[PDB]
Amino acid sequence: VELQELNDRFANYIDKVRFLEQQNKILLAELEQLKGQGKSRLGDLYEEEMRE
Amino acid sequence: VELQELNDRFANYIDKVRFLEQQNKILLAELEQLKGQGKSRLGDLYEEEMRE
Amino acid sequence: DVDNASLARLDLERKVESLQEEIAFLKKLHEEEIQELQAQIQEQHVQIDVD
Amino acid sequence: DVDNASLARLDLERKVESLQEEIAFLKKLHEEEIQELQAQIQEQHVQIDVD
Amino acid sequence: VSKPDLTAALRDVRQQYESVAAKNLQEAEEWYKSKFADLSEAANRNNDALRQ
Amino acid sequence: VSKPDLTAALRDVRQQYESVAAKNLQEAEEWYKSKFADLSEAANRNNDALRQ
Amino acid sequence: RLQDEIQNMKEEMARHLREYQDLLNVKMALDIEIATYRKLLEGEESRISLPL
Amino acid sequence: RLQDEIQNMKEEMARHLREYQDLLNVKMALDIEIATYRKLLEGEESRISLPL
Amino acid sequence: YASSPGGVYATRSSAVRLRSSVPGVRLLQDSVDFSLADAINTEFKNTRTNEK
Amino acid sequence: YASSPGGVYATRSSAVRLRSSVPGVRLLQDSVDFSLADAINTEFKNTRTNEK
């Protein structure tokens, strides 16, 4: 348990990697919502309304 | 070291709470553009379908 | 081409009516897009950062 | 009134045509405003071990 | 206490300030649309003045 | 206070300032584009006033 | 008037080229931020004997 | 109509790459400040732990 | 893991050269990537991730 | 093992579109409700309010 504070200090440093993997996963979903809406979908629509 | 393993179980139970919230947060982010904008972008599209 | 164009003037009274509710769906879309930005700001940060 | 009525059509249609290219332009620029938000989420990486 | 304190709320305030910077960027895309609408309407009005 | 943590929140206030300063330059860029549409369609209107 | 409609459709295509490359810059940002959170994590593996 | 939106594009997109770069510059500045903190706080946890 | 279900892409259609005039009553499309709303659908879910 | 094909072919048809010189195509522009998307936006508020 001098070796279980240990593995769980190592675990919180791995779980730091999971916290960045999760914040980076919200970031990499939000970045696809950004690209999908901002320039593509809103451009794709109003470029056909401007043609009408 | 049971007092220190109790802080290290606080970290591994805070990992478990960080994942509880962040697996909800990834699911709210991977949904909220399908809900709120998921009705406003559907009127936005029905007025293009109404334009032709 | 004027009878066509003067009926076409009445088309803009209908198209400006239609586009004013499209711009109302687009305003509602900005109010939902601002609520979604505040959801995304809370959603990306409660896990407590790098550790 | 071919010219006047179809030009009264066009002087409004060109305003909405320009404003819809400007909405597309403001939305391909709002992509860069959400990219400054995504840059904050990318910089939060940053901090120390909790408890 | 095993948990420290306030240390949580300071990292959560940190990630909420990083999220409030993302909200201010989201509202600055509504400012960007507003100036792109100033442009689009100036382009329409000067077009309808030369079509006139 | 065992590690400062708050120095991150002060950098996120700085990244908010640098993001908002960049979007304030884009508000001015779209206002300069509005003026470029005014000047360009005034030059087209002068070429049409010469036909008129 | 067809060069207006066509070159406005080539503006929005040219905008979608830069906005798809903004979405690639959000990906490439997450690629380097994952990499540089890995440049934190050698020091966080050092910081409790821990995230490799 | 082509120039105002292809310039709103050209100016916004040369800003969005820099605006993502400056959110990632706030993240980089936080990474250095978090090092200067980490090598002292988690770097006195060092005599249990260590740095970068 | 297969892209394009059924082999699908937008293959060129081109028909008989029908010269219809079409007076072009536009549906304008305020959802030309209402996208700020779908990045906001990802933030209606990053707000869920932070709370979780 | 879930080998299940979640991708169904959303079947498109476009047989060769003859001389539509028949003018009898009335306009209708009926859209979008989609009140289920505002119910889903309310379920994202409710799911966040449960996560809170």
Residue numbers in the entry:
A (entry chain y), B (entry chain z): 105 to 156
C (entry chain 1), D (entry chain 2): 209 to 259
E (entry chain i), F (entry chain j): 260 to 311
G (entry chain AI), H (entry chain AJ): 364 to 415
I (entry chain l), J (entry chain k): 53 to 104
Reproduce passages from the article.
They provide cells with tissue-specific mechanical properties and are involved in numerous cellular processes. Vimentin is mainly expressed in cells of mesenchymal origin, in which it assembles into extensive, dynamic and hyperelastic filament networks.
To this end, we polymerized VIFs in vitro from bacterially expressed and purified human vimentin, and imaged the filaments using cryo-EM. The resulting 3D structure of VIFs reached a resolution of 7.2 Å. Comprehensive power-spectrum analysis yields a helical rise of 42.5 Å and a helical twist of 73.7°. The definition and initial folds of the vimentin domains, namely the 1A–1B (residues 86–253) and 2A–2B (265–411) domains, the linker L12 (254–264) and the head (1–85) and tail domains (412–466), were based on the AlphaFold prediction of the full-length vimentin dimer. The initial folds were adapted to the cryo-EM density map by molecular dynamics flexible fitting. The cross-section view shows that VIFs comprise 40 polypeptide chains, which are partitioned into five octameric protofibrils. The frontal, straight tetrameric α-helix bundle (red region) accommodates two antiparallel 2A–2B dimers (green to red colored α-helices). The lateral, curved tetrameric α-helix bundle (blue region) accommodates two antiparallel 1A–1B dimers (blue to green colored α-helices). The N-terminal ends (NTEs) of each 1A–1B dimer position the head domains to protrude into the filament lumen, where they interact to form the luminal fiber (blue chains). The protofibrils are connected laterally by interactions of the tail domains and connected centrally by interactions of the head domains.
